[PDB]
Amino acid sequence: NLYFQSRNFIIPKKEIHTVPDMGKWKRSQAYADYIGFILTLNEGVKGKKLTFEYRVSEAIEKLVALLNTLDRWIDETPPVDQPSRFGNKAYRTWYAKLDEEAENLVATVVPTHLAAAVPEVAVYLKESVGNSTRIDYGTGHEAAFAAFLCCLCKIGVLRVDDQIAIVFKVFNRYLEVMRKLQKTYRMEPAGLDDFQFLPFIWGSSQLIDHPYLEPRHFVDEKAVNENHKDYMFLECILFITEMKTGPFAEHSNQLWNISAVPSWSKVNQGLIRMYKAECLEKFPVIQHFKFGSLLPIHPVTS
């Protein structure tokens, strides 16, 4: 992609200020590029297990290392006894470290000739792990992580051969770290799932045309337990059953209803529509999205 020193980068800022601003978002270059990216990754993983032998580049290993740094800091930042009954205030300590170190982290991944991109790209990383004031996490934070990855593709740090690894290695790791934050700091949800959305899209794509596992099986704990290592969708269900009390039909009714859909292809197609409507076109969710040079607010070009 960008082989020569590049300097025209912009610190991303909010542009969806009120509900009327949703039109400029839907027409934006950023939206087109973002949904394009999600769908490109969705096609790439179709029919493949997490154990598929995919290419792992240096950039991918550096991204995993960046996530491991975040994980280490959780370990270094234990929960505290506190008066409040919701999220644990140690999250704020952990978040402060990420906020101060985000550019340094991103610089481990971005080559020298793209140094000027780091401040722009790091804003997406900073925005992808929850809210320090509320100690909550939602699908807007997840979207910020996907936007971070998208930026790295846009500047050529990640390439087309990396697309399986982006989902199966990097995003997969990110979800592990997010689950650890959610559980360790008792984060509140900021609906399909309390916290996530994308892994259900990419995960259902893995299972398209599966010869044995059908959507009805994801609400069978034994099928989940026996197959979760191969399938991101099933790993998400396992986390829910660990986190929630009582019958699945009652605590996760949307997913329960989805388990009745006849095929994973139809699950995938439906989840894409649902994501666009309930995340990307939902002001309270997507108002968080920031726009710079790489994911810009200007109308999409032809």
Determine if residue 284 is labeled as part of a ligand binding site.
yes
Neighbours of 260 (CB within 10 A): 10
Distance CA 199, CA 11 (A): 28
Residue spans in the chain of domains classed CATH 1.20.120.1150: 192-302
Angle formed at CA 192 by CA 84 and CA 209, multiple of 5 degrees: 145
Would you say 41 and 87 are in contact if contact means Cβ atoms under 8 Å apart? no
Cβ density class 23-62: b for 16+ within 10 Å, e for less: ebbeebbbbebbeebbeebbebbbebebeeebebeebbeb
Residue 6's region, left for phi above 0, alpha for psi from -120 to 50, else beta, is beta
CATH architecture for segment(s) 192-302: Up-down Bundle (1.20)
Q: Report resolution in angstroms.
A: 1.6
Neighbours of 158 (CB within 10 A): 23
Distance CA 190, CA 10 (A): 28
In the 8-state DSSP scheme, what is residue 288?
Answer: T
Distance CA 32, CA 16 (A): 16
Determine if residue 134 is labeled as part of a ligand binding site.
yes
- Integer-rounded Cα Rg, in Å, for the chain is 19
Distance CA 118, CA 133 (A): 25
Would you say 189 and 197 are in contact if contact means Cβ atoms under 8 Å apart? no
Distance CA 276, CA 280 (A): 5
Experimental method reported for this structure: X-ray
Angle formed at CA 282 by CA 281 and CA 288, multiple of 5 degrees: 100
Distance CA 137, CA 182 (A): 8
Determine if residue 288 is labeled as part of a ligand binding site.
yes
Max Cα separation, the chain?
Answer: 56
Distance CA 16, CA 23 (A): 9
The CA–CA distances, whole Å, from 254 to 123, 201, 221, 247 equal 32, 14, 17, 13
Residue 280's Cα: distance from chain center in Å? 13
Would you say 66 and 108 are in contact if contact means Cβ atoms under 8 Å apart? yes
Could you tell me what percentage of the chain is helix, strand and coil, using 3-state DSSP and rounding each to the nearest 5? 60, 5, 35
Pairing of strands 136-137, 188-189: parallel
Residue of 88, 71, 70, 87 lying closest to 79 (CA atoms): 88
Determine if residue 194 is labeled as part of a ligand binding site.
yes
Element (H, E) at 153: helix 139-154
Q: Three-state DSSP class for 133?
A: coil
Q: Can you read off the two tokens belonging to residue 64?
A: 């995993």
Distance CA 165, CA 57 (A): 9
CA atoms within 13 A on the CB side of 280: 25
Would you say 293 and 32 are in contact if contact means Cβ atoms under 8 Å apart? no
Beta strands in the chain (DSSP E): 13-14, 136-137, 188-189, 290-291
Determine if residue 191 is labeled as part of a ligand binding site.
no
Residue 206's Cα: distance from chain center in Å? 17
